[PDB]
Amino acid sequence: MRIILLGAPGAGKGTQAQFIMEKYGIPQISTGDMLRAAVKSGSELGKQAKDIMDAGKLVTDELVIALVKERIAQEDCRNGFLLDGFPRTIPQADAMKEAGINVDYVLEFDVPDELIVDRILKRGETSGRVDDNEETVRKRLVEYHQMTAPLIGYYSKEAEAGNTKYAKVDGTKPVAEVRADLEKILG
Ligand SMILES: Nc1ncnc2c1ncn2[C@@H]1O[C@H](COP(=O)(O)OP(=O)(O)OP(=O)(O)OP(=O)(O)OP(=O)(O)OC[C@H]2O[C@@H](n3cnc4c(N)ncnc43)[C@H](O)[C@@H]2O)[C@@H](O)[C@H]1O
Numbered sequence: 416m417r418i419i420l421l422g423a424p425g426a427g428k429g430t431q432a433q434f435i436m437e438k439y440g441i442p443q444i445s446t447g448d449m450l451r452a453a454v455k456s457g458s459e460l461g462k463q464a465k466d467i468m469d470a471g472k473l474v475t476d477e478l479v480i481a482l483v484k485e486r487i488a489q490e491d492c493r494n495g496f497l498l499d500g501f502p503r504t505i506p507q508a509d510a511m512k513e514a515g516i517n518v519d520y521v522l523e524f525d526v527p528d529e530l531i532v533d534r535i536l537k538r539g540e541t542s543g544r545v546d547d548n549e550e551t552v553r554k555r556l557v558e559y560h561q562m563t564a565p566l567i568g569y570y571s572k573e574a575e576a577g578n579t580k581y582a583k584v585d586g587t588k589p590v591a592e593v594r595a596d597l598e599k600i601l602g
Pocket residue numbers: 423424425426427428429430431446447448450467468471472473474475476479499500501502503504507534535537538546555586587588589590593
């Protein structure tokens with residue numbers, strides 16, 4: 416059971432991941448988490464991200480692709496995993512295809528741009544990430560619309576070809592209601 420969660424930053428993807436991990440017994444592969452951990456621990460693979468992330472830019476495809484390939488080769492990903500924050504560009508999705516990483520579900524969280532900003536502010540006040548500042552968040556959203564949002568069509572086409580199942584949920588609904596709409600899809 417392999418699942419990709421698509422959407423804009425702050426769309427609620429990490430919030431919903433916990434429910435999905437618990438129900439299907441799979442770990443979450445969050446490139447954002449793996450990179451912040453790399454920085455903290457000084458790991459050779461990923462410490463380089465620190466400055467890119469605080470700038471609200473994307474990290475290079477080559478670095479994030481490697482981190483992910485290493486994470487998913489571990490035995491606890493044998494029976495599936497939940498990708499949260501990867502693929503974030505077309506080249507990253509192409510690498511998965513070329514490496515034979517098929518996925519069973521692609522789930523798109525639709526949330527308007529104006530809602531993201533306020534959602535990330537309200538959570539940036541306690542998690543103290545520099546990329547949750549207001550102006551950085553508006554840079555991340557522009558990058559999102561240019562580099563990441565085309566994945567919606569990329570994977571809508573994959574599902575048409577029978578390679579995955581594609582669904583959209585309305586992420587403006589409250590947390591419990593989003594959860595239940597995702598269960599209608601996955602169950
Ligand atoms: N693959 C990659 N390639 C290249 N670079 C990469 C990369 N991956 C990472 N990077 C780099 O690393 C940086 C960080 O990326 P990344 O770690 O991915 O940060 P992010 O996931 O984009 O930001 P969030 O974690 O806040 O988004 P979310 O969808 O999880 O929303 P959330 O659930 O938290 O919820 C948000 C807020 O809303 C709340 N909320 C959640 N759901 C709802 C709801 N239904 N209704 C109301 N409020 C809700 C939440 O409580 C919360 O406060 C990137 O900018 C890049 O530099």
